[PDB]
Design a protein around this motif. Structure first.
Motif, mmCIF file in Angstrom:
data_model
loop_
_atom_site.group_PDB
_atom_site.id
_atom_site.type_symbol
_atom_site.label_atom_id
_atom_site.label_comp_id
_atom_site.label_asym_id
_atom_site.label_seq_id
_atom_site.Cartn_x
_atom_site.Cartn_y
_atom_site.Cartn_z
ATOM 1 N N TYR A 1 0.455 -1.239 0.200
ATOM 2 C CA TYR A 1 0.213 0.212 -0.019
ATOM 3 C C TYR A 1 0.601 1.190 0.111
ATOM 4 O O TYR A 1 1.815 1.396 0.290
ATOM 5 N N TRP A 2 0.210 2.641 -0.458
ATOM 6 C CA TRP A 2 0.941 3.183 -0.186
ATOM 7 C C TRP A 2 0.861 3.766 0.881
ATOM 8 O O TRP A 2 -0.228 3.935 1.294
ATOM 9 N N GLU B 1 -0.587 7.867 2.555
ATOM 10 C CA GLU B 1 -0.384 9.005 2.159
ATOM 11 C C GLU B 1 -0.142 9.858 3.368
ATOM 12 O O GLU B 1 -0.408 9.950 4.723
ATOM 13 N N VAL C 1 -1.640 13.586 4.886
ATOM 14 C CA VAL C 1 -2.230 14.912 4.692
ATOM 15 C C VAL C 1 -1.915 15.733 6.087
ATOM 16 O O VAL C 1 -1.625 15.243 7.097
ATOM 17 N N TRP D 1 -3.886 18.031 1.327
ATOM 18 C CA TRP D 1 -2.612 15.928 0.634
ATOM 19 C C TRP D 1 -1.695 16.543 0.522
ATOM 20 O O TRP D 1 -0.638 17.556 -0.272
ATOM 21 N N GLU E 1 2.837 10.872 -1.050
ATOM 22 C CA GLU E 1 2.088 9.228 -0.926
ATOM 23 C C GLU E 1 3.643 8.541 -1.506
ATOM 24 O O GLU E 1 4.169 9.132 -2.365
ATOM 25 N N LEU F 1 5.791 4.548 -1.544
ATOM 26 C CA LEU F 1 5.670 3.499 -1.363
ATOM 27 C C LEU F 1 6.616 2.540 -1.059
ATOM 28 O O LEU F 1 7.733 2.101 -1.687
ATOM 29 N N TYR G 1 9.252 5.294 -5.141
ATOM 30 C CA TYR G 1 8.186 6.254 -5.669
ATOM 31 C C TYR G 1 7.408 6.234 -4.199
ATOM 32 O O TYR G 1 7.095 6.224 -3.802
ATOM 33 N N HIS H 1 5.014 10.200 -4.403
ATOM 34 C CA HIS H 1 4.606 11.947 -5.260
ATOM 35 C C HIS H 1 4.541 12.625 -4.490
ATOM 36 O O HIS H 1 3.531 12.535 -3.643
ATOM 37 N N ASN I 1 3.633 16.504 -3.362
ATOM 38 C CA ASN I 1 2.370 18.031 -3.295
ATOM 39 C C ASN I 1 3.382 18.699 -4.135
ATOM 40 O O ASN I 1 3.890 19.504 -3.169
ATOM 41 N N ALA J 1 -3.553 3.473 0.917
ATOM 42 C CA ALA J 1 -4.146 3.851 -0.263
ATOM 43 C C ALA J 1 -3.291 2.447 -1.331
ATOM 44 O O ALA J 1 -2.435 2.203 -2.069
#
Ligand SMILES: *[C@@H]1O[C@H](CO)[C@@H](O[C@@H]2O[C@H](CO)[C@@H](O[C@@H]3O[C@H](CO[C@H]4O[C@H](CO)[C@@H](O)[C@H](O[C@H]5O[C@H](CO)[C@@H](O)[C@H](O)[C@@H]5O)[C@@H]4O)[C@@H](O)[C@H](O[C@H]4O[C@H](CO)[C@@H](O)[C@H](O)[C@@H]4O)[C@@H]3O)[C@H](O)[C@H]2NC(C)=O)[C@H](O)[C@H]1NC(C)=O
Ligand SMILES: *[C@@H]1O[C@H](CO)[C@@H](O[C@@H]2O[C@H](CO)[C@@H](O)[C@H](O)[C@H]2NC(C)=O)[C@H](O)[C@H]1NC(C)=O
Ligand SMILES: *[C@@H]1O[C@H](CO)[C@@H](O)[C@H](O)[C@H]1NC(C)=O
Ligand SMILES: *[C@@H]1O[C@H](CO)[C@@H](O)[C@H](O)[C@H]1NC(C)=O
Ligand SMILES: *[C@@H]1O[C@H](CO)[C@@H](O)[C@H](O)[C@H]1NC(C)=O
Ligand SMILES: *[C@@H]1O[C@H](CO)[C@@H](O)[C@H](O)[C@H]1NC(C)=O
Ligand SMILES: *[C@@H]1O[C@H](CO)[C@@H](O)[C@H](O)[C@H]1NC(C)=O
Ligand SMILES: *[C@@H]1O[C@H](CO)[C@@H](O)[C@H](O)[C@H]1NC(C)=O
Ligand SMILES: [Ca+2]
Ligand SMILES: [Ca+2]
Ligand SMILES: [Ca+2]
Ligand SMILES: [Ca+2]
Ligand SMILES: [Ca+2]
Ligand SMILES: [Ca+2]
Ligand SMILES: [Mg+2]
Lengths: 601, 219, 218, 427
Positions: C32-33, C35, C37, C47, C50, C52, C57, C59, C61, C99
């Protein structure tokens, strides 16, 4: 290996009748030999009885009309008496239509037993459709006809004997006792029912549908944890307890959480003596059972088929093949685990599907066995395997493969779904074999050929061709010659006292490839010599001497490679017919071709 | 990138009634999947957010059948069937299609109730506080509904708004009223330079301000 | 029993940097990622990014590039987030969750509050709030306590050890200048005061403070 | 070994083993090469690996915002490999499986409708939506179907008195007439359509205990377009409170022709239960395996011991306990699915004669498989990679062509093409 697969006899009843569903030898008294064939979808001339099923009698000696249906019951369906008419009355009390009469056919002496496992009857009380099944016994060469339906009783529903289908399997003992399989009794627990012929006749009163047979034998209703076991899916007979009264072998194919089992009951009082469990779930262990002495030590061995058995290829792919298990009776008892297993090679060809003892087929001192895979072979027509018996048990490799000689139809063929062997139709002392093929409405009779076995020798006295040393002549020039001699020993009883052989000798048998032939016979000046020999059944080594010479040539090329000599022989395919038109065959384990050499310096 | 608008900031609802809560998106959350990627979360006070609805229509496990979600490709609504005390909180939508993922500023959801006038009290600085050189006049306004109230401070007659610090409680679970605290804080010198301190509460439960007052020189 | 346990509350000074952890159990961490917040009181949820666990990996914001760095430790099933160059903008509660592309944020952590204040630990001044006059809306009198000039939160306020907790209001604390201030009111029937002793119990554990204030008339 | 009586011409000393040398006798490596022969003229045209099609296992680099096309997902790599094989010399290669997070799921719900499932039927009324809702946690694209079965409609399995032929049960009990198999609903994503249509089915009954769901499973497996299977992962839920008829039982009824494994639906009814035997277990194994049907046996407590045994004979199956009122099916399905989808089992196709495969697995926690276990890995959770060392030998030169035998995880259409090319000729 000796069954005349070349041209066997093909009996064939009406289209779509399932002629060949079960097959039996008949001999009323002594040697009025005929073949019995059941055809349970056959139409009859019984009043208002659609496809009641029939059993055909086919006498052996050559005839115009092949088989005539034996009348066991020419009457239609008995009517319910309780209301013959009263206010509304036409009620048949039984239902003979589609009853599958002839599904199983057995015979002992002049008595023959034929069953309808789908026979059903309304009861005389509340209306049911109980497929209780029924058999018809005919005694002393058809002089009296008895009905035997033990499951048609005062216990009438799936919960009792109502759904028993007694007759589904059946066999006679050595004393003519009737043994009955009823897979559906007591919510499909299954039931073996048995009674002596005299008891049946003592107790046959056809004016009442329920005939309690006195002193009848019966497996007993168990707790419901035994429901859906199908006891009596198949039966066989054999001696497995100490005594002399034959014992009962019964299939229980759905018995132990659907891994099957086979039970053996005590012949004198139905009672459990042995059990043997299957090895795989829903493999149909006990689909067919047979009992014969396979290893000549006198004691009856047990054979159990399980045609739905899956195995894994070496490359791991699952496949339905079928498997036969041979347990083996010893002085101490019977071994609880199999001693041998055989396995089918053809996928979906139900291998353990039918089993019949053949007796001693090749007349060598050991009883053999035939097993069918009704869907094996290149075109899924069906196959019967013959397996030779021997000192160490059943031979794990087949002595002969039987297949139908006709082409495939649209419908499956079921060749080998019915088997009966171990008895002798024709003159010779070689047992024979009936193979049903109900898919195309035929049955095939194979008979055993008489067995001759020979061996030959071949020796060259001066093994060296001495090219310059010439000790004989022909036209003029001296030639270097050699003595070729060969001998023959042939034997095999139930055959003519003198046995016609033919013998072929070939010189330079490899160089006869359009090339040059270096050695020639002195008598003909050629490379081959075929000849007839009469050989006596138990006689001496019968020999022949003759002279082969080397070519008077500084003219042929190959001086290096040795001269190869080859002798082959077979039984003269002429002047052979004895008791019935059936030529003898060479034992498959005797060398009919022999090879030798003669060199030069 | 994608903007989530939850226009209504809060919704008062009588327990038993049903509510729809709406969320808009400036881009369609509908994927080529046929799946549209809108989520709904509920934050009960002082707890973390909990997932309610996933991919627009589907319920998260443990979430009662009362909750149902549906929507266009750009306009979505969450419908709660029989609003209980346990459904009180902030309802957030969330888009899960494009980076960065975006929540709308949530909508609060509160119980409706019989209107109630505040119980207003005012307290002087204490001996303790004056000793240290500070002066606080505290004004409690307890147990009122609706939420919306307004407090003015007056010193010697005239409105002042510079030293004032206000604190509101969340809606009470037991009786669904609100309370509020208003504290005017001055220097002990500035404090002794005026006589009368008053907090006026103009709530909806009256036309005239609820006025409570302290007079430094009263005995 | 899927569970995200986050690290406790953290007090920081402007310009510093902080590392929050999120420990995952009850499921395979690398499936799962995680996340991240942010929640400020007044800006809702936001947000951050995230990551992995097994991979590398991430990502982000973009708004937070160079503010938040994401790392994981697969051997202890923990996700970490680092906040650097702390300002008053970075003072919030921070949630990790979980997620997949098809199913986002089913389970959440309990949250971690990051406070950015150049203030030091300070005990709370406890001032009594006794009434100026004998005034009431019903036959019930209101008394109170003013707790001010303290850092950090929490502070707990009870009345008479805890014997009396019906009709208490203790309001959210608020930021005085760089210290916290909070008040508490207690409504009590007229007969039971001054007759019966009413005392507010104020504790500030983050300095081991236990002050009692009996509220006397006048 | 090759040390003894073995000597021929050219392309025969080649196909005799690994060692046997021949200088341009056929005995050994470290004996011929121990004695005077130049390693210039010696013959060894040995075997090679050659990877032709090899899309990478899909990684989740593009993050949670990428909702990935089912046709892009790649769980198994390599995909097309050519193996040049010499006699006696194994040519081994590795295969990488990675479990994707999200795959469309077709699920068919096949249920016993004999009278003991009246309770059960009344619970299944609402199952369509509650199961859709649940399955969607696992899949973005879920379709549901429903089918019923009771028994073969012939003596002796059903009672054939005109009365019981219309109402197989008691007076009060309102049983509909017996039937073999009914396709109530081919695969839809309208779970509510499930709900309405399932609640319109009437309960039946029959005589003997074990039912004829095997007649039903087969049709469900082989009637492709009529059921609506897409080339995705396929779940068949088979739920019942009784045992099962299988091949051989048909005899009692006069049925003796073995199941043909063909479709015989008409108006969504299996028409040939009179005419064909129940399939054998082996038969189902074949047609289920060949149609990628992962089977979930949802059977009651009292038939666990049996269906557990069934489970061991059906590759890619799973079993679980159903409550008498069928209240627990969804959890059952989920649990069954999780175990199914967390274990990969590798299967190859028909090899040609002188060719054998071996398998070695390397799963999580260093747990390594060997032999028959070489093709199993379990404990695979989403995103997990596992590897397989697949090892192929040969005995001698058979077909001087090629064989395109596929290696495949059971349940998945994704394959690995493996092209054998045999080296026979001299050089
Ligand atoms: C080969 O394999 C087969 C299959 O496994 C074996 O056969 C089975 O063996 C077992 C063990 O013996 C059998 O169960 C037992 O049955 C006996 C005999 O039952 C009959 O006789 C009783 C005495 O007169 C009588 O009471 C019975 O009647 C009752 O039961 C019937 C049917 O349920 C019912 O109709 C009646 O209303 C009665 O209630 C019956 O006619 C029995 O005595 C045993 O009882 C023991 O256990 C029970 C409870 O467990 C207990 O109540 C008793 O007190 C006692 O302790 C037991 O039930 C089974 O029925 C056999 N046969 C078949 C066909 O399934 C066989 O043994 C194996 N052979 C070999 C050589 O290994
Ligand atoms: C299963 O196989 C793996 C890989 O071959 C084994 O792990 C290796 O062990 C060797 C020797 O100890 C190490 O040198 C390697 O570094 C390991 N490789 C990897 C990829 O982990 C493992 O030991 C085997 N399992 C068991 C139970 O022995
Ligand atoms: C038997 O007769 C019936 C009715 O006359 C007919 O329909 C059927 O074809 C016949 N079957 C056989 C096997 O002769
Ligand atoms: C038996 O009966 C048949 C007539 O069905 C007859 O042909 C035959 O001669 C009889 N055989 C014996 C041995 O009595
Ligand atoms: C068979 O039954 C009889 C009793 O009915 C008994 O004498 C005999 O011993 C039994 N056989 C065996 C092998 O137990
Ligand atoms: C039934 O089969 C099981 C599984 O093979 C076996 O262990 C058990 O012993 C069998 N029962 C009998 C009575 O043979
Ligand atoms: C010898 O073998 C050949 C087969 O090549 C055959 O034609 C011939 O009939 C055989 N002769 C004898 C006498 O067996
Ligand atoms: C699935 O794949 C096979 C193999 O190519 C193909 O022949 C078949 O038509 C496909 N089925 C469907 C329903 O798309
Ligand atoms: Ca005996
Ligand atoms: Ca023996
Ligand atoms: Ca023999
Ligand atoms: Ca004969
Ligand atoms: Ca049934
Ligand atoms: Ca039930
Ligand atoms: Mg049932």
């Amino acid at each position: 290996f000796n069954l005349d697969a070349e041209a066997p006899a093909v009996l064939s009843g009406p289209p779509g009748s399932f002629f060949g569903f079960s097959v039996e030898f008949y001999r009323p008294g002594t040697d009025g030999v005929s073949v019995l064939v059941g055809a349970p979808k056959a139409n009859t001339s019984q009043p208002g009885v659609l496809q009641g099923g029939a059993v055909y009698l086919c006498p052996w000696g050559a005839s115009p009309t092949q088989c005539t249906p034996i009348e066991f019951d020419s009457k239609g369906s008995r009517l319910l008496e309780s209301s013959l008419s009263s206010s509304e009355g036409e009620e048949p009390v039984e239902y003979k239509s589609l009853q599958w009469f002839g599904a199983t056919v057995r015979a002992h002496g002049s008595s023959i037993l034929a069953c309808a496992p789908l026979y059903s009857w309304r009861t005389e009380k509340e209306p049911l459709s109980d497929p209780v099944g029924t058999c018809y016994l005919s005694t002393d060469n058809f002089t009296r006809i008895l009905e035997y339906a033990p499951c048609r009783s005062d216990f009438s529903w799936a919960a009792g004997q109502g759904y028993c289908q007694g007759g589904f399997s059946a066999e006679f003992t050595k004393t003519g006792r009737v043994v009955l399989g009823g897979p559906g009794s007591y919510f499909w627990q299954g039931q073996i029912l048995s009674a002596t012929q005299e008891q049946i006749a003592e107790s046959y009163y056809p004016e009442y549908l329920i005939n309690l047979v006195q002193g009848q034998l019966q497996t007993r209703q168990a707790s419901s944890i035994y429901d859906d076991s199908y006891l009596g899916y198949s039966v066989a007979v054999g001696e497995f307890s100490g005594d002399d009264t034959e014992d009962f072998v019964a299939g229980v194919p759905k018995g132990n959480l659907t891994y099957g089992y086979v039970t053996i009951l005590n012949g004198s009082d139905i009672r459990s003596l042995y059990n043997f469990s299957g090895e795989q779930m829903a493999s149909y262990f006990g689909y067919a059972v047979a009992a014969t002495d396979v290893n000549g030590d006198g004691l009856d061995d047990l054979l159990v088929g399980a045609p739905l058995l899956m195995d894994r290829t070496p490359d791991g792919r699952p496949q339905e093949v079928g498997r036969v298990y041979v347990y083996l009776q010893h002085p101490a008892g019977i071994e609880p685990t199999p001693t041998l297993t055989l396995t089918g090679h053809d996928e979906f060809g139900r291998f353990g599907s039918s089993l019949t003892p053949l007796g001693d087929l090749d007349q060598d001192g050991y009883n053999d066995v035939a097993i069918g895979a009704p869907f094996g072979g290149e075109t899924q027509q069906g196959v019967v395997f013959v397996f030779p018996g021997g000192p160490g048990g059943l031979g794990s490799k087949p002595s002969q493969v039987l297949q139908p000689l006709w082409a495939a139809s649209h419908t499956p063929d079921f060749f080998g779904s019915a088997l009966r062997g171990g008895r002798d139709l024709d003159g010779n002392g070689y047992p024979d074999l009936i193979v049903g093929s109900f898919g195309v409405d035929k049955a095939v009779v194979y008979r055993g050929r008489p067995i001759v076995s020979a061996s030959a020798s071949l020796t060259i006295f001066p093994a060296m061709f001495n090219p310059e040393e010439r000790s004989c002549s022909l036209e003029g020039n001296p030639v270097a010659c050699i003595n070729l001699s060969f001998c023959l020993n042939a034997s095999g009883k139930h055959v003519a006292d003198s046995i016609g052989f033919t013998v072929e000798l070939q010189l330079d048998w490899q160089k006869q490839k359009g090339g040059v032939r270096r050695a020639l016979f002195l008598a003909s000046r050629q490379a081959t010599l075929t000849q007839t020999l009469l050989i006596q059944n138990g006689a001496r080594e019968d020999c022949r001497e003759m002279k082969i010479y080397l070519r008077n040539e500084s003219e042929f090329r190959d001086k290096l490679s040795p001269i190869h000599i080859a002798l082959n022989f077979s039984l003269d395919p002429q002047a052979p017919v004895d008791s019935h038109g059936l030529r003898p065959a060479l034992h498959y384990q005797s060398k009919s071709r022999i090879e030798d050499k003669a060199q030069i310096l | 990138d994608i903007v989530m608008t939850q226009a209504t900031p809060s919704i008062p609802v009588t327990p038993g009634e049903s509510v729809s809560i709406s969320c808009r998106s400036n881009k369609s959350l509908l994927h080529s999947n046929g799946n549209t990627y809108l989520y709904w979360f509920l934050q009960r006070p002082g707890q973390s957010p909990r997932l309610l609805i996933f991919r627009m229509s589907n319920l998260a496990s443990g979430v009662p059948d009362r909750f149902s979600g549906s929507g266009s490709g750009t306009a979505f609504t969450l419908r709660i069937s029989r609003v209980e005390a346990a459904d009180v909180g902030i309802y957030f939508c969330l888009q899960h299609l494009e980076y960065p993922f975006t929540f709308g500023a949530g909508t609060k959801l509160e119980l409706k109730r019989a209107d109630a006038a505040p119980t207003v009290s005012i307290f002087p600085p204490s001996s303790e506080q004056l000793t240290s050189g500070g002066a606080s006049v505290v004004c409690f306004l307890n147990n009122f509904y609706p939420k919306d109230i307004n407090v003015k401070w007056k010193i010697d007659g005239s409105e002042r708004q510079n030293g004032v610090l206000n604190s509101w409680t969340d809606q009470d679970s037991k009786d669904s009223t609100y309370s509020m605290s208003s504290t005017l804080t001055l220097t002990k010198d500035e404090y002794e330079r005026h006589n009368s301190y008053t907090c006026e509460a103009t709530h909806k439960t009256s036309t005239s301000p609820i006025v409570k007052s302290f007079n430094r020189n009263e005995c | 029993q899927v569970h995200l346990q986050q690290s406790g509350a953290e007090l920081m000074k402007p310009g510093a940097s902080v590392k929050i952890s999120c420990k995952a159990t009850g499921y395979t961490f690398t499936s799962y990622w995680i996340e991240w917040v942010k929640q400020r009181p007044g800006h809702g949820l936001e947000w951050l990014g995230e990551i992995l666990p097994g991979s590398g990996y991430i990502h982000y914001n973009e708004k937070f590039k160079g503010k938040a760095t994401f790392t994981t430790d697969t051997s202890s099933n923990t996700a970490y987030m680092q906040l650097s160059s702390l300002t008053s903008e970075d003072s919030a509660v921070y949630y990790c969750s979980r997620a997949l592309a098809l199913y986002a944020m089913d389970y959440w952590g309990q949250g971690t509050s990051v406070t950015v204040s150049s203030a030091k630990t300070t005990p709370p001044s406890v001032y009594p709030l006794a009434p100026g006059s004998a005034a009431q809306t019903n036959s019930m009198v209101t008394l109170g306590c003013l707790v001010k000039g303290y850092f950090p939160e929490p502070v707990t306020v009870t009345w008479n050890s805890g014997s009396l907790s019906s009709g208490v209001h203790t309001f959210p604390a608020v930021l005085q200048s760089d210290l916290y201030t909070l008040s508490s009111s207690v409504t009590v029937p007229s007969s039971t005061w001054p007759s019966e002793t009413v005392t507010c119990n104020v504790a500030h554990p983050a300095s081991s403070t236990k002050v009692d204030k009996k509220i006397v008339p006048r | 070994r090759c040390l003894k009586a073995n000597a021929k011409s050219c392309g025969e000393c080649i196909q005799a083993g690994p060692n046997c040398g021949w200088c341009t006798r056929c005995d050994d490596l470290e004996a011929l090469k121990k004695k005077g022969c130049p390693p210039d003229d010696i013959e060894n045209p040995r075997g090679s690996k050659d990877i032709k099609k090899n899309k990478n296992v899909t990684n989740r680099s593009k993050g949670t915002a990428e909702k990935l096309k089912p046709e892009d997902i790649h769980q198994i790599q390599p995909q097309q490999l050519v193996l040049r094989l010499r006699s006696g010399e194994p040519q081994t290669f590795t295969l990488k499986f990675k479990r994707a997070e999200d795959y469309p799921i077709d699920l068919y719900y096949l249920m016993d409708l004999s009278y003991s499932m009246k309770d059960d039927l009344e619970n299944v009324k609402s199952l369509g939506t509650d199961l859709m809702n649940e399955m969607r946690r696992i899949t973005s694209d879920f379709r549901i179907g429903f089918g019923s079965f009771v028994e073969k409609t012939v003596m002796p399995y059903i009672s054939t008195t005109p009365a019981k032929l219309r109402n197989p049960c008691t007076s009060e009990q309102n049983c509909t007439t017996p039937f073999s198999y009914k396709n109530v609903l081919s695969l839809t994503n309208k779970g509510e359509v499930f709900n309405e249509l399932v609640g319109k089915q009437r309960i039946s009954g029959n005589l003997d205990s074990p039912e004829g769901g095997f007649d039903a499973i087969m049709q469900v497996a082989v009637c492709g377009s009529l059921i609506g299977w897409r080339n995705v992962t396929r779940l068949l839920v088979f739920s019942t409170d009784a045992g099962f008829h299988f091949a051989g039982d048909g005899k009692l009824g006069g049925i003796v022709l073995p199941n043909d494994g063909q479709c015989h639906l008409e108006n969504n009814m299996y028409t040939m239960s009179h005419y064909y035997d129940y399939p054998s277990i082996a038969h189902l194994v074949q047609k289920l395996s060949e149609n990628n049907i992962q089977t979930i046996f949802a059977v009651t407590e009292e038939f666990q011991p049996v269906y557990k045994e069934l489970k061991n004979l059906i590759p890619k199956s799973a079993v679980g306990t159903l409550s008498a009122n069928s209240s627990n099916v969804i959890q059952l399905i989920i649990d069954a699915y999780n175990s199914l989808s967390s274990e990969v089992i590798l299967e190859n196709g028909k090899l040609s004669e002188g060719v054998t495969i071996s398998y070695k697995s390397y799963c999580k926690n260093g747990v390594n498989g060997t032999g028959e276990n070489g093709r199993k890995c379990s404990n695979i959770s989403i995103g997990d990679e596992v590897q397989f060392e697949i090892s192929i030998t040969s005995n001698k030169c058979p077909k001087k062509d090629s064989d395109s035998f596929k290696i495949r995880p059971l349940g998945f259409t994704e394959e690995v093409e493996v092209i054998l090319q045999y080296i026979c000729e001299c050089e």
